[PDB]
Amino acid sequence: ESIVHQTASLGDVEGLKAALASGGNKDEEDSEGRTALHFACGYGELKCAQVLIDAGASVNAVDKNKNTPLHYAAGYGRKECVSLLLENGAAVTLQNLDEKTPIDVAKLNSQLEVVKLLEKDA
C-alpha cells in the first residue's frame, strides 16, 4: 500500500507528484529496502525517476542486498535511466552484497549497450 512506490512503478507521473505533494515520502522503503527510485529505474520510468530525484531522493540508496538504483537500471537495461542516474552523481563503483558493481550486473545480464554506456561515462 505505498502510493509513492505504485505511481512510480507504473509511470504515473501526475499520481507521483500528487502523492509527494500530499505528504508522501520519497525515501520510503519497502520490506526489502527498495525505494521508489529503485523501481522507477528498474522499470525504465524516466520521468518518474526525475521527479523523485528532483524531490531529493537519494540517488545511491541501497536495498537490503546493497543494490542501488543504478544496479537496477543497468541490470534490466534501462539506458535512459542509467544516463539520468549518472548525470546525478550515481556511484558506478558501489558494490553489491555479491561484490558486483552496476557494470558487473549489466555484463552478467548481457546488457552490452549499457556496459558501453557506463564505460563511456568514466
Side-chain angles (χ1 to χ4, degrees), residues 4-5 20 24 29 45 50 54 58-59 62-64 70 81 83-86 94 99 102 113 120 122:
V4 178
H5 289 214
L20 289 168
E29 283 174 38
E45 289 292 349
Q50 265 272 49
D54 295 333
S58 173
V59 169
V62 124
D63 62 8
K64 280 177 178 181
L70 186 63
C81 286
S83 320
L84 169 54
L85 288 166
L86 294 165
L94 292 177
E99 239 205 319
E113 222 196 305
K120 156 191 176 183

Side-chain angles (χ1 to χ4, degrees), residues 47-102:
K47 295 175 184 178
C48 281
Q50 265 272 49
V51 168
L52 300 170
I53 288 170
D54 295 333
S58 173
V59 169
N60 292 306
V62 124
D63 62 8
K64 280 177 178 181
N65 268 299
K66 296 300 154 168
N67 276 311
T68 67
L70 186 63
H71 281 284
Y72 282 51
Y76 290 102
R78 339 240 64 156
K79 294 187 263 296
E80 306 209 273
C81 286
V82 165
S83 320
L84 169 54
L85 288 166
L86 294 165
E87 306 168 1
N88 283 278
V92 77
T93 63
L94 292 177
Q95 276 160 42
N96 232 332
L97 270 198
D98 238 71
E99 239 205 319
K100 303 305 153 62
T101 69

